[PDB]
């Protein structure tokens, strides 16, 4: 199979600057060279160049709506494209709002995809529930059908089409859910596993369940939107919104490992790595490396080891 | 329901000074303001002013027996009082010897209460088994019926009445048990879950069992005596007796979360936070915050999120 | 039963210097005094003095083959000796190549011993698969029968006799396995538990299985070759090859605790503690202490507590 890396240097999803430098760091850490060393064909599509919407006024609270809608519009296009040619797409973050784009384009080509969202937050606030207008905290609201018409059309997102229903998404690692957001996920009966659940069930049973819950009936394509903040800050320090008491490096890799084992990985998102927010070089290198690590996991790299087939090492 | 906070500025339970500054820090961290934000009525009763027994000579090894017996006698009184008015009491530590008082007063009003003791130590040494005379390491021995008459009447505790039996208490997080103490908990067949058990069973099954074990027959009031030392030192550094390889921040919150879910929380103890023992501001703030956090957990605050009923966030 | 401590100050197993200072640190931390405090007879055999083979030229890639073969030859001798007198041997590392010696001597006296290898690495590279000639990464290859003749005789190991088969060893905590090494452990069908397994099954079930797998039929002597690198670097920092996402202090102690509980402990290896590789005093003391701790665990020390029999602490 083919693997296509698409850098999305974007950050207007939220106020903190730096995230755009994200895909650069990941590459510098050698994500591509390493990926090539797996059983997959690696094609680096490069870094999208986003056009900045001049005079992008705040639609109510929502900030930079037009810039974020144009950034995402453009991505969904590139993603739909490579997805069409049969290659798995791997979007490197800036912030998480690029998920609207990533998930959209992919949805075009595979409308029956299910989404596994590993993150500390739900990011399901609507333009009417956010406290800040940071669109990085509203991604899943633009993609959800059940939430269509539940909020006023946003300047620039007119191209968006609610592609999945609350019965196709599964959250893992939740621990900082705004009140509104909690209502939304309870009302729509969305399947999640808050940290408390991971604690109660153990990362193992968690996957076991998320799978039989998303692939019990039909075996469909899987979209992994992994928000590097879903791991405890100790592991991924250089982030915009760290929240303590989260997934461990081990648990993180177990998810990507089980996901690889299903062979249904269709699209990936390695978002929120902010090279500038490291309190020391270590913290950033630390973050950038577990990010690069989680990815390689989705594509083979097993912790027990890997040997090349048809070769007798004896 | 009503919630009443009672600060117990005491520290003669053990040699290290500072713990009395405990309830102050917790408040400074805003325990009250936050508590108010939950579905409970918060009443701050203030900080008990303890009278210091002049010329309190060591009854054998037991140190400051009269001061500690007067401190606890006074608390049990305030606790019995508010417990009577139907409010849940939440005692902020100084040291853990204040538990004799806390558990006693509460027992008066609800003699059928069971006690869940989350701690690094058993604290079940009798005046005849301690190595030091620190009464903070003997609390459960004054409350236990099975241990009545097993030791010399202590100067000042004459008011105490063994209110519970070894069949009403459950330990969670044990890892530093003196030889004598181990004998005592084995002989009396007390139900506990040493770290090794948490490890073998997982915090999940642990609660599942401690509940069917304490609430299988009758559903009675629960007394949670939480010793901040029960978490690994990494999480609650500013303590008098850190012991490595203990509960994680996650596990800690899981217990308080499952306890809230039973709706039987009758009384709480947030003990051993010692603002002065922090090797850096961080460590204390770190400690003080996970303490404040565990509390809010017992009273609603779920990690998956919380939304106010009857309100349509859409 | 008797306990015999044998210090092996060796380090030519790998390029990084310092590991020889290993057994010294452990002793300084008071391993012996503490061990004495358990229900075992402690005899300190001292520190072997290794003769340095002059002009030890590299056999192909394998470095210091003669020095390492003489170091191990000598150890196997001392170990076979004390093992003969019926005492349990406890070898303190330098590097892990001393395992050839340790396991060999022991095998002489108890040819039916099974080996539990707690380590981050497999250390099963043969002189023909290593990238470096560091023999510390080849120990299990010299001891395995199935790998006999699979590589050219090495200068100094002529005395070695493949004592165990791939059906007697069990790995726990694997996470950094070279490609060759992975082939070897897959081809020979060796039973292991890579971190992913620990994650999936939980340290509890892991032991439960490793036991019924090694002691289901016959109850034989157990050799515990514990490589301090098997725990996450956070816990045992001062090592030559740290690899993140490994066993936790808790899990580590759980293994040594379950192993003690089988009563079949015949020989031990506390290897890779490198006092000089600590980035600060703390890190080394931290490392040296969890090492000393794991040992005491294998010999009684329970986390729930220990009391001396026939003594009424009341
Ligand atoms: Mn997110
Ligand atoms: Mn997030
Ligand atoms: Mn205590
Ligand atoms: Mn304690
Ligand atoms: Mn090793
Ligand atoms: Mn190793």
UniProtKB/Swiss-Prot annotation, chains A, B, C:
Residues given in the record as substrate binding sites: 121-125, 132-134, 178, 241, 272
EC number: 3.5.3.1
Transmembrane segments: none
GO cellular-component term (any): extracellular space
Effect annotated for changing residue 227 to A: Loss of one manganese ion and strongly reduced catalytic activity
Broad class of where this protein is predominantly found: cytoplasm
Enzyme class: hydrolase
GO MF terms held by the record: arginase activity; identical protein binding; manganese ion binding
Assembly and interaction partners: Homotrimer. Interacts with CMTM6.
Protein name per UniProt: Arginase-1
Organism whose genome encodes this protein: Rattus norvegicus (Rat)
Gene coding for it: Arg1
């Amino acid at each position: 199979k083919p693997i296509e890396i698409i850098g999305a240097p974007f950050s207007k999803g939220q106020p903190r600057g730096g995230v755009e430098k994200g895909p650069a760091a990941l590459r510098k850490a050698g994500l591509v060279e390493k990926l090539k060393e797996t059983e997959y064909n690696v094609r680096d599509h490069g870094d999208l160049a986003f056009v900045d919407v001049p005079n992008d006024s705040p639609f109510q609270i929502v900030k930079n709506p037009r810039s974020v809608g144009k950034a995402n519009e453009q991505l969904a296009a590139v993603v739909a494209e490579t997805q069409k040619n049969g290659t798995i797409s791997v979007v490197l973050g800036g912030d998480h709002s690029m998920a609207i784009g990533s998930i959209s384009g992919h949805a075009r080509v595979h409308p029956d995809l299910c989404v596994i969202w590993v993150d500390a937050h739900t990011d399901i606030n609507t333009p009417l529930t956010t406290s800040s207008g940071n669109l990085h905290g509203q991604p899943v609201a633009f993609l959800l059908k059940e939430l269509k018409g539940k909020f006023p059309d946003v300047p620039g997102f007119s191209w968006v089409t609610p592609c999945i229903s609350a019965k196709d998404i599964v959250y893992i690692g939740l621990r900082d859910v705004d009140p509104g957001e909690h209502y939304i996920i309870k009302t729509l009966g969305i399947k999640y596993f808050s940290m408390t659940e991971v604690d109660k069930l153990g990362i193992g049973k968690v996957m076991e369940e998320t799978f039989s819950y998303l692939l019990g009936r039909k075996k469909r394509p899987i979209h992994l939107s992994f928000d590097v903040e879903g791991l405890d800050p100790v592991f991924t320090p250089a982030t915009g919104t760290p929240v303590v008491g989260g997934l461990s490096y081990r648990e993180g890799l177990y998810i990507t490992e089980e996901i690889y084992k299903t062979g249904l990985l269709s699209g990936l998102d390695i978002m929120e790595v902010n090279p500038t927010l490291g309190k020391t070089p270590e913290e950033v290198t630390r973050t950038v490396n577990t990010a690069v690590a989680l990815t390689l996991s989705c594509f083979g790299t097993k912790r027990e080891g890997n040997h090349k087939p048809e070769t007798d090492y004896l």
